[PDB]
Amino acid sequence: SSNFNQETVTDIHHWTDTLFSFRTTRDPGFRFQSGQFIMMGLEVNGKPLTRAYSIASSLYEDGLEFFSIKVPNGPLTSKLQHLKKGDQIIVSKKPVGTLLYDNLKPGKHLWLLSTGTGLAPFLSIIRDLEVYERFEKVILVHGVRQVAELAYTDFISNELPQDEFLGEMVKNQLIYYPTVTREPYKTRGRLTDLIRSGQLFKDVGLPEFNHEDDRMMLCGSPEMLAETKQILEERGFTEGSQSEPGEFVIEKAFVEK
């Protein structure tokens, strides 16, 4: 240890039996950009047990936040799911990630396409003032299997527009598009299937993807990433990086182990 920050959990909210979010303290020296992740975990037998976790809290927040999965036989989240208020967690002090604005070229629209816990890094981005200065429209797409998996759906819809600080920009510039596959919901199907049929653009009121206006940030399941990456690359969109800005950047919400 000592390469980590000791933070204290301040709030825990369990969305389902597999999804829960918890907030912690934020070290005064901990600094990050919206869309980055860190090594988050526990101190086990004097050794760090950490996994990659996107920072779901705003960089303006005096605190951290993590949108976490709950795996029964998972080394970290089986102990991490039983977190309580006041418990100690360790966060690495070196953020890293590809979900940065500077990895994208200046555009008119930012399409945040996410599934499951891939909403975590975009909860920080939509709660960043800079994304609304750089992009006229921020489209936050969240794909889940059940309605109960739509975490933060009342916060983004009802409480984020009332933010004393980002409210008028979230009201004007943020578009929130949740979709559910396996339960009756007002939006059905995979987010890829909504791109092929064009229902995504009919619902959000924006034209189809073009190389001049639309930038994308992808953070979801490997099967959504590989399917949306083929969709984006075959229309001409290129992947951006630190050395070469592009139209879309991609981060894994998890890996299949």
Ligand X SMILES: Cc1cc2nc3c(=O)[nH]c(=O)nc-3n(C[C@H](O)[C@H](O)[C@H](O)COP(=O)(O)OP(=O)(O)OC[C@H]3O[C@@H](n4cnc5c(N)ncnc54)[C@H](O)[C@@H]3O)c2cc1C
Give the residue ranges of the annotated binding site for FAD.
51, 53-54, 67, 69, 76-77, 117, 255-257
Q: Which residues pair with 177 in a beta bridge?
A: 141
Cα gap 160→123, rounded to integer Å = 10
Rounded Cα gap, residues 217 and 242, in angstroms: 14
**Distance (Å, rounded) from C-alpha 196 to C-alpha 208?**
11
Out of 48, 63, 74, 189, the residue judged to bind ligand X by CB under 6 A: 74
Which of 8, 78, 88, 157 forms a contact with ligand X (CB under 6 A)? 78
5 makes contact with ligand X (CB under 6 A): no
47-54, strands of its sheet edge to edge: 47-54, 37-44, 88-92, 4-14, 19-24, 64-69
Where would I find the H helices in 146-187? 153-154, 167-173
State the nearest-atom distance from the C-beta of 136 to ligand X, in Å: 27
Binding region for ligand X (CB under 6 A) out of 61-69, 84-92, 174-182, 226-234: 61-69
Task: Mark the segment that binds ligand X (CB under 6 A) among 76-84, 160-168, 174-182, 201-209.
Answer: 76-84
Q: What is the DSSP letter of 207?
A: P
246 is an interface residue for ligand X by CB under 6 A: no
Q: Is there binding between residue 71 and ligand X (CB under 6 A)?
A: yes
Measured in degrees and rounded to the nearest 5, phi and psi for residue 228 equal -80, -30
Q: 141 forms bridges with which residues in the sheet?
A: 113, 177
Closest approach, Cβ 123 to ligand X, in A, equals 9
**From the list 15, 25, 27, 52, which residue makes contact with ligand X (rule: CB under 6 A)?**
52
Which part of the chain contacts ligand X (CB under 6 A), choosing from 3-11, 45-53, 87-95, 135-143? Answer: 45-53
Site for ligand X (CB under 6 A): which residue of 3, 13, 75, 82?
Answer: 75
Among 36, 50, 117, 192, binds ligand X (CB under 6 A): 117
How many other CB atoms are there within 10 angstroms of residue 248's CB atom?
A: 22
Residue closer to ligand X (CB basis): 107 or 253: 253
Rounded Cα distance between 147 and 153, Å, is 10
What DSSP character marks residue 117? G
* Known binding residues: 51, 53-54, 67, 69, 76-77, 117, 144-145, 181-182, 190, 227, 255-257
By CB under 6 A, tell whether 198 contacts ligand X.
no
Q: Which residues are annotated as a binding site for NADP(+)?
A: 144-145, 181-182, 190, 227
Calculate the CA 132 to chain-centre distance.
16
Q: Are 74 and 13 in contact (CB under 8 A)?
A: no
Contact residues for ligand X, defined by CB under 6 A: 37, 51-54, 67-69, 71, 74-78, 116-117, 120, 251-257
